[PDB]
């Protein structure tokens, strides 16, 4: 397995399968099985009329060429695709369970104050009402947070307990932050209230968004919010906890001024401590206020989700797809790297190919390290726009 920096073209991505946009993608990958969702929109990826929500599961199967492939088993459509949002899926004992939220009032992140804090989980058999079940979550323990909600693609299991990524909405009228801790010392222009203002969408926002886990014990059913440690605190963001090589590693989207990559090994699950890497190479596209490689505190909420995956803890090597663009959703390139160094990469498209919300969930196939990614990829000219799937073997030797 390549451990040397090298520009050799060792990484060899293989693409593995009208006026509509598929967006809001989910992919999860557990031990052999996968979860997935999207939303089908009529027209614009943002506004277009929502055609049909899907949520499906199935198996990740190699055939003869020892490339893995998608084999959807079970697929589920809610009855109105307008009102389900921010789903997330943790597999368990021959199920994927997937926690969506429900809404009467649109995407809660953006009309939070009017959001009934309503939830619902769907369990889908991977090897198919054993096949398909619904639950309207009735009891939810969240502590001080007015209301909680999933916030990321996938979680993990612990004996009889699931953990989803989720987010807490505390009104700052109650939010406790010391401004002296806002690190501006090498930041000529950056003020102290920055960090605190930047915990919300508007600096004035009713709530702030704190990241964490939603706890779900099958040995009981009640969901229970666990907030993330205040450490390298950034506004709530879609994030994912995932088991790797024996322990789980967390990732938070860098959705405001801290635009370096937020990932790391979880030291405790509840309360949630993450030994965030001091990584200096990966980042994301922002906009004007908090663009690529911004470290300085700013009043912003902007960015995209691009997780990576720990592929070797011993030398903390991760991998994943990154958008190589300062302020624009372009140029998805698969990146294999370390805290202070990208070993080898690979561009998945042209220089000017549009991409957006990337994901990666890795595994062994037939004794060798593979990474599926997702992506949301498209080209100017293209007719229907949808997420694409990429396998990627990880090279054994650092030769071509």
């Amino acid at each position: 397995i390549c451990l040397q920096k090298t520009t050799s073209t060792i990484l060899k991505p293989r693409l593995i399968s009208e006026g509509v946009c598929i967006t809001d993608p989910l992919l999860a990958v557990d031990n052999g099985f996968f979860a997935y969702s999207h939303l089908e929109k009529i027209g614009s990826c943002t506004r277009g009329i929502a055609k049909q929500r899907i949520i499906g599961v199935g198996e990740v199967l190699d055939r003869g060429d020892k490339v893995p492939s998608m084999f959807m088993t079970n697929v589920w459509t809610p009855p109105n695709p307008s009102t389900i949002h921010h789903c997330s899926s943790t597999y368990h004992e021959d199920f994927y369970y997937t926690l969506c939220a429900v809404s009467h009032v649109g995407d809660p992140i953006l009309n939070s104050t009017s959001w009934t804090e309503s939830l619902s989980l769907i369990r889908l058999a991977v090897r198919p009402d054993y096949n398909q079940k619904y639950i309207a979550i009735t009891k939810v323990e969240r502590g001080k947070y007015d209301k909680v909600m999933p916030y990321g693609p996938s979680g993990i299991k612990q004996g009889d307990t699931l953990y989803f990524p989720a987010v807490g909405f505390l009104p700052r009228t109650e939010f406790q932050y010391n401004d002296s801790n806002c690190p501006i010392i090498h930041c000529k222009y950056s003020k102290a209230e920055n960090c605190r203002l930047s915990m919300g969408v508007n600096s004035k926002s009713h709530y702030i968004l704190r990241s964490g886990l939603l706890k779900y014990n099958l040995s009981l059913i009640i969901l229970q919010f666990i907030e993330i440690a205040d450490n390298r605190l950034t506004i709530g963001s879609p994030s994912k906890i995932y088991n790797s090589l024996g322990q789980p590693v967390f990732y938070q989207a860098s959705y405001s001024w801290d635009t370096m990559i937020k990932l790391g090994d979880v030291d405790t699950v509840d309360p949630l401590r993450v030994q965030w890497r001091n990584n200096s190479v990966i980042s994301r596209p922002g906009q004007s206020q908090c663009p690529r490689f911004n470290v300085c505190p700013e009043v912003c909420w902007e960015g995209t989700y691009n997780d990576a995956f720990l592929i070797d803890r011993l030398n903390w090597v991760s991998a994943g797809v990154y958008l190589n663009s300062n302020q624009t959703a372009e140029n998805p390139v698969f990146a294999v790297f370390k805290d202070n160094e990208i070993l080898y990469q690979v561009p998945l498209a042209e220089d000017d190919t549009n991409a957006q919300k990337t994901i990666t969930d890795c595994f062994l196939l037939e004794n060798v390290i593979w990474c599926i990614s997702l992506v949301e990829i498209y080209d100017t000219g293209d007719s229907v726009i949808r997420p694409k799937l990429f396998a990627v073997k990880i090279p054994a030797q650092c030769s071509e």
């Binding site: 614009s44 943002t46 624009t328 372009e330 000017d352």
Partner: protein, 131 residues
């Protein structure tokens, strides 16, 4: 194509007095709007038409450029397509018009003036004729 960077500045001879700066991007282009470093103070917002034609930005409105750094080039890049780091569902589409202005008076004192400004007295307003 990467079109000609547009400097948001009182001097810019492209902001014509009756119809502001009109530009015809095509889907797939990318455009920089840039407030240079010294200083004129501006918050610039993508608006709708009525807001353009009335020079008004309403509380909801979140800016695309916060030009309040005397000694720093503050720059914003639009690529015209459906995918943006923008988390408010603002994208770009053929045969549609999109209006970028500010109601700022330019001083640091009138920065957040939500009405009037250099949109309505200079014609500081980009009209992007997409497609």
């Amino acid at each position: 194509i990467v079109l000609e960077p547009i400097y948001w500045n009182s001097s810019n001879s492209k902001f014509l007095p009756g119809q502001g700066l009109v530009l015809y991007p095509q889907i797939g282009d990318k455009l920089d709007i840039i407030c240079p470093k010294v200083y004129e103070y501006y918050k610039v917002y993508m608006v709708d038409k009525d807001q353009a034609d009335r020079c008004t930005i309403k509380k909801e409105n979140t800016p695309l450029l916060n030009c309040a750094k005397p000694d720093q080039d503050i720059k914003f890049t639009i690529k015209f397509q459906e995918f943006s780091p923008n988390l408010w569902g603002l994208e770009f589409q053929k045969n549609k018009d999109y209006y970028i202005i500010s109601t700022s008076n330019g001083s640091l004192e009138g920065l957040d003036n939500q009405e009037g400004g250099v949109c309505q007295t200079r014609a500081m307003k980009i009209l992007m004729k997409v497609g």
